[PDB]
Swiss-Prot record, chain B:
Protein name, entry field: K(+)/H(+) antiporter subunit KhtT
The keyword Cell membrane is assigned to this record: yes
One Pfam family matching this protein: TrkA_C
Triggers of expression: Part of the khtSTU operon. Induced by salt stress at alkaline pH.
A GO BP annotation: potassium ion transport
Keywords recorded for this protein, A-Z: Cell membrane, Membrane
Activity regulation information from UniProt: Binds cyclic di-AMP (c-di-AMP), which may regulate the activity.
Assembly mode: The transporter is composed of the integral membrane protein KhtU and the regulatory protein KhtT.
Gene name, Swiss-Prot/TrEMBL: khtT
Origin species: Bacillus subtilis (strain 168)
Role: Required for activity of the potassium/proton antiporter KhtU. Involved in protection of the cell from methylglyoxal, a toxic by-product of glycolysis.
Membrane topology of this protein: Peripheral membrane protein
Cellular component, GO annotation: plasma membrane
Residue ranges annotated for the RCK C-terminal domain, each copy included: 78-161
Length: 160, 161
Protein backbone atom coordinates (compact mmCIF):
# COMPACT_ATOMS: atom_id res chain seq x y z
CA UNK A 1 0.00 0.00 0.00
CA UNK A 2 2.91 2.31 0.78
CA UNK A 3 5.75 3.37 -1.43
CA UNK A 4 9.35 3.65 -0.31
CA UNK A 5 10.92 6.61 -2.08
CA UNK A 6 14.56 7.70 -1.80
CA UNK A 7 15.36 11.13 -3.18
CA UNK A 8 18.84 12.40 -3.94
CA UNK A 9 20.05 15.70 -5.29
CA UNK A 10 22.09 15.62 -8.50
CA UNK A 11 23.99 18.91 -8.12
CA UNK A 12 23.46 21.16 -11.14
CA UNK A 13 21.63 18.39 -12.99
CA UNK A 14 18.29 17.76 -11.32
CA UNK A 15 16.95 15.16 -8.91
CA UNK A 16 16.73 11.38 -8.67
CA UNK A 17 13.79 9.47 -7.11
CA UNK A 18 14.19 5.73 -6.47
CA UNK A 19 10.79 4.16 -5.89
CA UNK A 20 10.02 0.69 -4.53
CA UNK A 21 6.46 -0.55 -4.66
CA UNK A 22 4.31 -2.78 -2.53
CA UNK A 23 4.54 -5.24 -5.44
CA UNK A 24 8.35 -5.30 -4.91
CA UNK A 25 9.03 -3.50 -8.22
CA UNK A 26 11.61 -0.73 -8.68
CA UNK A 27 11.48 2.42 -10.78
CA UNK A 28 13.94 5.33 -10.88
CA UNK A 29 12.83 8.69 -12.19
CA UNK A 30 15.45 11.31 -13.03
CA UNK A 31 14.11 14.81 -13.49
CA UNK A 32 16.51 17.16 -15.33
CA UNK A 33 16.41 20.91 -14.91
CA UNK A 34 15.74 21.38 -18.62
CA UNK A 35 12.56 19.35 -18.20
CA UNK A 36 13.65 15.99 -19.56
CA UNK A 37 12.66 12.92 -17.51
CA UNK A 38 14.34 9.53 -17.70
CA UNK A 39 12.60 6.51 -16.18
CA UNK A 40 14.39 3.20 -15.49
CA UNK A 41 12.74 -0.06 -14.45
CA UNK A 42 14.93 -2.65 -12.75
CA UNK A 43 14.83 -6.29 -11.86
CA UNK A 44 13.41 -6.53 -8.32
CA UNK A 45 15.85 -9.25 -7.21
CA UNK A 46 18.80 -7.98 -9.27
CA UNK A 47 18.73 -4.19 -9.60
CA UNK A 48 21.81 -4.31 -11.80
CA UNK A 49 19.56 -5.68 -14.55
CA UNK A 50 17.76 -2.97 -16.46
CA UNK A 51 14.35 -4.10 -17.74
CA UNK A 52 13.29 -1.01 -19.71
CA UNK A 53 13.93 2.75 -19.78
CA UNK A 54 12.33 5.69 -21.46
CA UNK A 55 13.15 9.30 -22.12
CA UNK A 56 10.39 11.87 -22.03
CA UNK A 57 10.31 15.61 -22.64
CA UNK A 58 8.53 17.87 -20.18
CA UNK A 59 5.28 17.88 -22.15
CA UNK A 60 5.21 14.08 -22.56
CA UNK A 61 5.98 13.56 -18.91
CA UNK A 62 3.14 15.78 -17.78
CA UNK A 63 0.64 14.11 -20.14
CA UNK A 64 1.55 10.66 -18.88
CA UNK A 65 1.44 11.95 -15.29
CA UNK A 66 -2.05 13.36 -15.86
CA UNK A 67 -3.30 9.97 -17.16
CA UNK A 68 -1.58 7.98 -14.41
CA UNK A 69 -2.77 10.33 -11.72
CA UNK A 70 -6.45 10.08 -12.64
CA UNK A 71 -6.69 13.59 -14.12
CA UNK A 72 -8.00 12.41 -17.48
CA UNK A 73 -10.11 9.44 -16.46
CA UNK A 74 -11.00 9.41 -12.76
CA UNK A 75 -11.52 5.92 -11.26
CA UNK A 76 -15.26 5.83 -10.82
CA UNK A 77 -15.35 4.34 -7.32
CA UNK A 78 -13.12 6.95 -5.68
CA UNK A 79 -15.21 9.81 -4.25
CA UNK A 80 -12.43 11.41 -2.20
CA UNK A 81 -8.65 11.04 -1.90
CA UNK A 82 -6.00 11.99 0.65
CA UNK A 83 -2.57 13.25 -0.39
CA UNK A 84 0.45 11.43 1.06
CA UNK A 85 2.18 13.43 3.82
CA UNK A 86 -0.65 15.94 3.92
CA UNK A 87 -4.11 16.49 5.36
CA UNK A 88 -5.37 17.99 2.09
CA UNK A 89 -8.37 16.01 0.90
CA UNK A 90 -9.66 16.25 -2.67
CA UNK A 91 -13.34 15.39 -3.08
CA UNK A 92 -15.58 14.93 -6.11
CA UNK A 93 -19.16 15.92 -5.33
CA UNK A 94 -22.04 15.62 -7.78
CA UNK A 95 -24.79 18.13 -7.15
CA UNK A 96 -28.07 16.24 -6.63
CA UNK A 97 -31.61 17.37 -7.43
CA UNK A 98 -32.74 20.38 -5.42
CA UNK A 99 -29.49 21.47 -3.78
CA UNK A 100 -29.46 25.13 -2.74
CA UNK A 101 -26.42 25.80 -4.91
CA UNK A 102 -28.17 24.84 -8.15
CA UNK A 103 -28.23 27.93 -10.35
CA UNK A 104 -25.98 29.95 -8.04
CA UNK A 105 -22.38 31.06 -8.58
CA UNK A 106 -19.12 30.42 -6.75
CA UNK A 107 -18.99 34.09 -5.77
CA UNK A 108 -22.56 34.07 -4.44
CA UNK A 109 -21.82 30.97 -2.37
CA UNK A 110 -18.42 32.51 -1.44
CA UNK A 111 -17.04 28.98 -1.10
CA UNK A 112 -13.42 29.85 -0.36
CA UNK A 113 -14.22 32.95 1.75
CA UNK A 114 -16.84 31.30 3.97
CA UNK A 115 -15.75 27.65 3.99
CA UNK A 116 -11.99 27.68 3.29
CA UNK A 117 -12.60 25.23 0.44
CA UNK A 118 -11.18 25.79 -3.03
CA UNK A 119 -13.07 24.58 -6.12
CA UNK A 120 -10.23 23.48 -8.39
CA UNK A 121 -12.40 22.20 -11.25
CA UNK A 122 -15.96 21.71 -12.51
CA UNK A 123 -17.04 18.68 -14.57
CA UNK A 124 -20.05 19.33 -16.79
CA UNK A 125 -22.56 16.67 -17.86
CA UNK A 126 -20.88 16.77 -21.27
CA UNK A 127 -17.77 15.73 -19.29
CA UNK A 128 -15.51 18.66 -20.20
CA UNK A 129 -13.38 19.94 -17.34
CA UNK A 130 -13.28 23.64 -16.48
CA UNK A 131 -10.05 24.30 -14.58
CA UNK A 132 -9.77 26.99 -11.93
CA UNK A 133 -13.38 28.27 -11.98
CA UNK A 134 -13.94 31.84 -10.83
CA UNK A 135 -16.63 33.84 -9.07
CA UNK A 136 -19.00 33.87 -12.04
CA UNK A 137 -19.04 30.08 -12.60
CA UNK A 138 -22.64 28.92 -12.21
CA UNK A 139 -23.34 25.65 -10.43
CA UNK A 140 -25.79 23.37 -12.25
CA UNK A 141 -27.53 20.01 -11.83
CA UNK A 142 -25.33 16.91 -12.31
CA UNK A 143 -22.19 19.04 -12.37
CA UNK A 144 -19.37 17.45 -10.40
CA UNK A 145 -17.41 19.87 -8.20
CA UNK A 146 -13.76 19.11 -7.51
CA UNK A 147 -13.07 20.47 -4.05
CA UNK A 148 -9.79 20.92 -2.22
CA UNK A 149 -9.49 21.53 1.50
CA UNK A 150 -9.56 20.11 5.02
CA UNK A 151 -12.04 17.38 5.93
CA UNK A 152 -13.84 19.46 8.55
CA UNK A 153 -14.39 22.29 6.07
CA UNK A 154 -15.45 19.90 3.29
CA UNK A 155 -18.09 18.23 5.48
CA UNK A 156 -19.35 21.69 6.43
CA UNK A 157 -19.63 22.84 2.80
CA UNK A 158 -21.28 19.60 1.70
CA UNK A 159 -23.72 19.65 4.64
CA UNK A 160 -24.74 23.18 3.64
CA UNK B 1 2.34 17.25 -27.08
CA UNK B 2 4.48 14.75 -29.00
CA UNK B 3 2.36 11.81 -27.83
CA UNK B 4 -0.04 9.57 -29.72
CA UNK B 5 -2.65 8.51 -27.14
CA UNK B 6 -5.55 6.16 -27.73
CA UNK B 7 -8.21 5.63 -25.07
CA UNK B 8 -10.66 2.72 -25.02
CA UNK B 9 -13.34 1.58 -22.58
CA UNK B 10 -12.95 -1.64 -20.58
CA UNK B 11 -16.47 -2.61 -19.41
CA UNK B 12 -16.50 -3.73 -15.78
CA UNK B 13 -12.84 -2.70 -15.41
CA UNK B 14 -12.13 0.95 -16.28
CA UNK B 15 -10.17 2.46 -19.19
CA UNK B 16 -7.08 1.62 -21.20
CA UNK B 17 -4.66 4.22 -22.60
CA UNK B 18 -2.17 3.27 -25.31
CA UNK B 19 0.61 5.86 -25.56
CA UNK B 20 3.31 6.20 -28.23
CA UNK B 21 6.13 8.75 -27.86
CA UNK B 22 7.70 11.14 -30.38
CA UNK B 23 10.67 8.76 -30.43
CA UNK B 24 8.20 5.91 -31.01
CA UNK B 25 8.34 4.30 -27.53
CA UNK B 26 5.14 2.67 -26.31
CA UNK B 27 3.33 2.12 -23.06
CA UNK B 28 -0.15 1.04 -22.06
CA UNK B 29 -1.80 2.26 -18.85
CA UNK B 30 -4.84 0.39 -17.51
CA UNK B 31 -6.88 2.38 -15.03
CA UNK B 32 -9.32 0.42 -12.88
CA UNK B 33 -12.46 1.91 -11.48
CA UNK B 34 -11.30 0.55 -8.10
CA UNK B 35 -8.16 2.71 -8.27
CA UNK B 36 -5.62 0.11 -9.38
CA UNK B 37 -3.28 0.95 -12.29
CA UNK B 38 -1.09 -1.35 -14.38
CA UNK B 39 1.52 0.00 -16.77
CA UNK B 40 3.04 -2.07 -19.60
CA UNK B 41 6.07 -1.16 -21.72
CA UNK B 42 6.48 -2.71 -25.17
CA UNK B 43 9.12 -3.06 -27.88
CA UNK B 44 8.60 -0.19 -30.30
CA UNK B 45 9.18 -2.43 -33.35
CA UNK B 46 6.99 -5.28 -32.07
CA UNK B 47 3.94 -4.32 -29.95
CA UNK B 48 3.51 -7.91 -28.70
CA UNK B 49 6.95 -8.07 -27.04
CA UNK B 50 6.65 -6.97 -23.41
CA UNK B 51 9.65 -5.11 -21.97
CA UNK B 52 8.33 -4.52 -18.47
CA UNK B 53 5.18 -4.02 -16.40
CA UNK B 54 4.26 -2.67 -12.96
CA UNK B 55 1.19 -2.84 -10.72
CA UNK B 56 0.19 0.14 -8.53
CA UNK B 57 -2.65 1.08 -6.18
CA UNK B 58 -4.30 4.51 -6.29
CA UNK B 59 -2.10 6.18 -3.70
CA UNK B 60 1.05 4.84 -5.37
CA UNK B 61 -0.04 5.92 -8.84
CA UNK B 62 -0.84 9.38 -7.51
CA UNK B 63 2.53 9.77 -5.79
CA UNK B 64 4.44 8.59 -8.86
CA UNK B 65 2.38 10.90 -11.09
CA UNK B 66 3.21 13.87 -8.83
CA UNK B 67 6.93 13.13 -9.16
CA UNK B 68 6.72 12.56 -12.90
CA UNK B 69 4.62 15.69 -13.45
CA UNK B 70 7.02 18.09 -11.72
CA UNK B 71 4.86 18.64 -8.63
CA UNK B 72 7.53 17.46 -6.16
CA UNK B 73 10.68 18.78 -7.78
CA UNK B 74 10.22 21.43 -10.49
CA UNK B 75 12.76 21.40 -13.36
CA UNK B 76 14.62 24.56 -12.48
CA UNK B 77 15.06 25.95 -15.98
CA UNK B 78 11.39 26.04 -16.90
CA UNK B 79 9.73 29.43 -16.60
CA UNK B 80 6.36 28.49 -18.10
CA UNK B 81 4.47 25.51 -19.48
CA UNK B 82 1.43 24.69 -21.60
CA UNK B 83 -0.78 22.65 -19.27
CA UNK B 84 -1.46 19.01 -20.25
CA UNK B 85 -4.82 18.41 -21.96
CA UNK B 86 -5.59 22.13 -21.67
CA UNK B 87 -5.05 25.46 -23.38
CA UNK B 88 -4.09 27.01 -20.04
CA UNK B 89 -0.54 28.14 -19.29
CA UNK B 90 1.35 27.85 -15.99
CA UNK B 91 3.96 30.52 -15.32
CA UNK B 92 6.49 30.96 -12.53
CA UNK B 93 6.92 34.67 -11.83
CA UNK B 94 9.46 36.10 -9.40
CA UNK B 95 8.37 39.33 -7.70
CA UNK B 96 11.52 41.47 -7.58
CA UNK B 97 12.78 44.82 -6.28
CA UNK B 98 10.26 47.64 -6.04
CA UNK B 99 7.34 45.66 -7.47
CA UNK B 100 4.13 47.52 -6.62
CA UNK B 101 2.37 44.31 -5.54
CA UNK B 102 4.75 43.86 -2.60
CA UNK B 103 2.98 43.79 0.77
CA UNK B 104 -0.46 43.67 -0.82
CA UNK B 105 -2.82 40.70 -0.55
CA UNK B 106 -4.39 38.62 -3.34
CA UNK B 107 -7.75 39.99 -2.23
CA UNK B 108 -6.68 43.62 -2.56
CA UNK B 109 -4.88 43.06 -5.87
CA UNK B 110 -7.97 41.04 -6.81
CA UNK B 111 -5.95 38.99 -9.30
CA UNK B 112 -8.48 36.39 -10.47
CA UNK B 113 -11.32 38.91 -10.61
CA UNK B 114 -9.38 41.58 -12.50
CA UNK B 115 -6.96 39.52 -14.62
CA UNK B 116 -8.64 36.11 -14.95
CA UNK B 117 -5.44 34.55 -13.57
CA UNK B 118 -5.41 32.07 -10.69
CA UNK B 119 -2.47 32.03 -8.30
CA UNK B 120 -2.23 28.26 -7.67
CA UNK B 121 0.82 28.31 -5.41
CA UNK B 122 3.23 30.72 -3.77
CA UNK B 123 6.86 29.64 -3.39
CA UNK B 124 8.88 31.75 -0.97
CA UNK B 125 12.56 32.55 -1.58
CA UNK B 126 13.55 29.55 0.55
CA UNK B 127 11.64 26.96 -1.56
CA UNK B 128 8.77 26.57 0.92
CA UNK B 129 5.48 26.24 -0.99
CA UNK B 130 1.89 27.30 -0.25
CA UNK B 131 -0.80 25.48 -2.24
CA UNK B 132 -4.04 27.24 -3.21
CA UNK B 133 -3.46 30.63 -1.52
CA UNK B 134 -6.47 32.78 -0.70
CA UNK B 135 -7.43 36.48 -0.56
CA UNK B 136 -5.42 37.01 2.63
CA UNK B 137 -2.06 35.67 1.43
CA UNK B 138 0.44 38.53 1.26
CA UNK B 139 2.84 38.93 -1.65
CA UNK B 140 6.39 39.35 -0.33
CA UNK B 141 9.72 40.58 -1.70
CA UNK B 142 11.29 37.46 -3.24
CA UNK B 143 8.21 35.26 -3.64
CA UNK B 144 7.63 33.28 -6.79
CA UNK B 145 3.95 33.24 -7.81
CA UNK B 146 2.78 30.15 -9.70
CA UNK B 147 0.26 31.61 -12.14
CA UNK B 148 -2.37 29.88 -14.25
CA UNK B 149 -4.40 31.39 -17.09
CA UNK B 150 -4.43 32.39 -20.74
CA UNK B 151 -1.37 33.85 -22.49
CA UNK B 152 -2.93 37.28 -23.03
CA UNK B 153 -4.11 37.54 -19.42
CA UNK B 154 -0.78 36.44 -17.95
CA UNK B 155 1.08 39.08 -19.95
CA UNK B 156 -1.18 41.91 -18.72
CA UNK B 157 -0.93 40.90 -15.04
CA UNK B 158 2.86 40.68 -15.12
CA UNK B 159 3.04 44.01 -16.97
CA UNK B 160 0.68 45.78 -14.52
CA UNK B 161 2.05 44.24 -11.32
N1 LIG C 1 -5.60 31.93 -5.52
C1 LIG C 1 -5.95 33.14 -6.03
N2 LIG C 1 -5.44 33.60 -7.19
C2 LIG C 1 -5.79 34.81 -7.69
N3 LIG C 1 -6.67 35.64 -7.08
C3 LIG C 1 -7.26 35.28 -5.91
C4 LIG C 1 -6.93 33.99 -5.30
N4 LIG C 1 -7.65 33.89 -4.16
C5 LIG C 1 -8.37 35.04 -4.04
N5 LIG C 1 -8.14 35.86 -5.08
C6 LIG C 1 -8.74 37.20 -5.30
O1 LIG C 1 -9.31 37.63 -4.06
C7 LIG C 1 -10.71 37.89 -4.22
C8 LIG C 1 -11.42 37.51 -2.94
O2 LIG C 1 -11.41 36.09 -2.82
P1 LIG C 1 -12.25 35.41 -1.64
O3 LIG C 1 -11.76 33.99 -1.43
O4 LIG C 1 -12.31 36.37 -0.48
O5 LIG C 1 -13.74 35.33 -2.28
C9 LIG C 1 -14.07 34.56 -3.42
C10 LIG C 1 -14.57 33.16 -3.07
O6 LIG C 1 -15.33 33.16 -1.85
C11 LIG C 1 -15.50 32.82 -4.23
N6 LIG C 1 -14.76 32.01 -5.24
C12 LIG C 1 -14.40 32.43 -6.47
N7 LIG C 1 -13.75 31.45 -7.16
C13 LIG C 1 -13.68 30.39 -6.34
C14 LIG C 1 -13.13 29.01 -6.43
N8 LIG C 1 -12.49 28.60 -7.56
N9 LIG C 1 -13.27 28.21 -5.35
C15 LIG C 1 -13.90 28.61 -4.23
N10 LIG C 1 -14.43 29.84 -4.09
C16 LIG C 1 -14.35 30.75 -5.09
O7 LIG C 1 -15.86 34.06 -4.85
C17 LIG C 1 -15.25 35.17 -4.17
C18 LIG C 1 -14.89 36.25 -5.18
O8 LIG C 1 -13.82 35.79 -6.01
P2 LIG C 1 -13.14 36.77 -7.09
O9 LIG C 1 -12.26 35.96 -8.02
O10 LIG C 1 -14.17 37.68 -7.70
O11 LIG C 1 -12.21 37.68 -6.14
C19 LIG C 1 -11.13 37.08 -5.43
C20 LIG C 1 -9.88 37.09 -6.30
O12 LIG C 1 -9.89 38.26 -7.13
CA1 LIG D 1 -17.56 37.67 -1.10
Amino acid sequence: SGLNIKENDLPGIGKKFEIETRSHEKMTIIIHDDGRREIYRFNDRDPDELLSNISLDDSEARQIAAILGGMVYKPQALESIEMAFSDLIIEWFKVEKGAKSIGRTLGELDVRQNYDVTVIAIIKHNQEKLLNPGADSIIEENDTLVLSGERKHLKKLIHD
